[PDB]
Motif scaffolding. Structure first.
Motif, PDB file in Angstrom:
ATOM      1  N   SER A 255      -2.358  70.570   0.321  1.00 58.08           N
ATOM      2  CA  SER A 255      -2.097  71.710   1.194  1.00 58.08           C
ATOM      3  C   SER A 255      -0.797  71.514   1.967  1.00 58.08           C
ATOM      4  N   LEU A 256      -0.446  72.499   2.788  1.00 58.71           N
ATOM      5  CA  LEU A 256       0.775  72.430   3.583  1.00 58.71           C
ATOM      6  C   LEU A 256       0.499  71.863   4.973  1.00 58.71           C
TER       7      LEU A 256
ATOM      8  N   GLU B 161       7.527  77.885  -4.621  1.00 59.02           N
ATOM      9  CA  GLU B 161       7.979  77.442  -5.935  1.00 59.02           C
ATOM     10  C   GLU B 161       7.424  76.060  -6.265  1.00 59.02           C
ATOM     11  N   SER B 162       7.281  75.227  -5.239  1.00 61.01           N
ATOM     12  CA  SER B 162       6.761  73.876  -5.420  1.00 61.01           C
ATOM     13  C   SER B 162       5.272  73.818  -5.099  1.00 61.01           C
ATOM     14  N   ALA B 163       4.551  74.875  -5.462  1.00 57.42           N
ATOM     15  CA  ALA B 163       3.117  74.943  -5.211  1.00 57.42           C
ATOM     16  C   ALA B 163       2.338  75.058  -6.518  1.00 57.42           C
ATOM     17  N   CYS B 164       1.316  74.222  -6.669  1.00 56.48           N
ATOM     18  CA  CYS B 164       0.494  74.230  -7.872  1.00 56.48           C
ATOM     19  C   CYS B 164      -0.696  75.174  -7.715  1.00 56.48           C
ATOM     20  N   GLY B 165      -0.419  76.402  -7.285  1.00 60.73           N
ATOM     21  CA  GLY B 165      -1.475  77.379  -7.101  1.00 60.73           C
ATOM     22  C   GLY B 165      -0.963  78.804  -7.146  1.00 60.73           C
ATOM     23  N   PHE B 166      -1.766  79.703  -7.707  1.00 63.98           N
ATOM     24  CA  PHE B 166      -1.392  81.108  -7.811  1.00 63.98           C
ATOM     25  C   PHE B 166      -2.239  81.967  -6.880  1.00 63.98           C
TER      26      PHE B 166
ATOM     27  N   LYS C 211      -0.703  76.110  -1.245  1.00 68.34           N
ATOM     28  CA  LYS C 211      -0.610  74.735  -1.719  1.00 68.34           C
ATOM     29  C   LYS C 211       0.846  74.287  -1.803  1.00 68.34           C
ATOM     30  N   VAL C 212       1.053  72.978  -1.884  1.00 70.77           N
ATOM     31  CA  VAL C 212       2.398  72.422  -1.970  1.00 70.77           C
ATOM     32  C   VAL C 212       2.408  71.122  -2.768  1.00 70.77           C
ATOM     33  N   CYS C 213       3.507  70.875  -3.474  1.00 67.37           N
ATOM     34  CA  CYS C 213       3.644  69.666  -4.278  1.00 67.37           C
ATOM     35  C   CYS C 213       4.496  68.628  -3.557  1.00 67.37           C
ATOM     36  N   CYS C 214       3.941  67.431  -3.388  1.00 65.47           N
ATOM     37  CA  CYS C 214       4.644  66.347  -2.716  1.00 65.47           C
ATOM     38  C   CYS C 214       4.693  65.101  -3.601  1.00 65.47           C
ATOM     39  N   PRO C 215       5.898  64.672  -4.016  1.00 60.55           N
ATOM     40  CA  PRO C 215       6.061  63.488  -4.867  1.00 60.55           C
ATOM     41  C   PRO C 215       5.553  62.218  -4.193  1.00 60.55           C
TER      42      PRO C 215
END
Length: 56
Positions: free
Chosen positions: A15-16, A41-46, A52-56
């Motif tokens: 999540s954010l 754009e960096s979220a794995c959810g529609f 949601k958010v993608c964090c390396p």
């Protein structure tokens, strides 16, 4: 869960309100539309209700 960033280099998806960097941006100050597109754009959810958010 592990997600793949736009650059494709493997990463984590949460999540954010978990990522330290993401948390600082929300509590930083600036919050323009450009920031929403970047996180969107960096979220794995529609979904629109559950962000949601993608964090390396």
């Amino acid at each position: 869960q592990a997600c793949t960033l736009p650059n494709n280099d493997k990463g984590t998806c949460k999540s954010l309100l978990q990522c330290d960097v993401a948390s600082k941006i929300i509590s930083k100050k600036p919050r323009t539309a450009q920031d929403e597109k970047f996180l969107r754009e960096s979220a794995c959810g529609f979904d629109g209700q559950t962000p949601k958010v993608c964090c390396p």
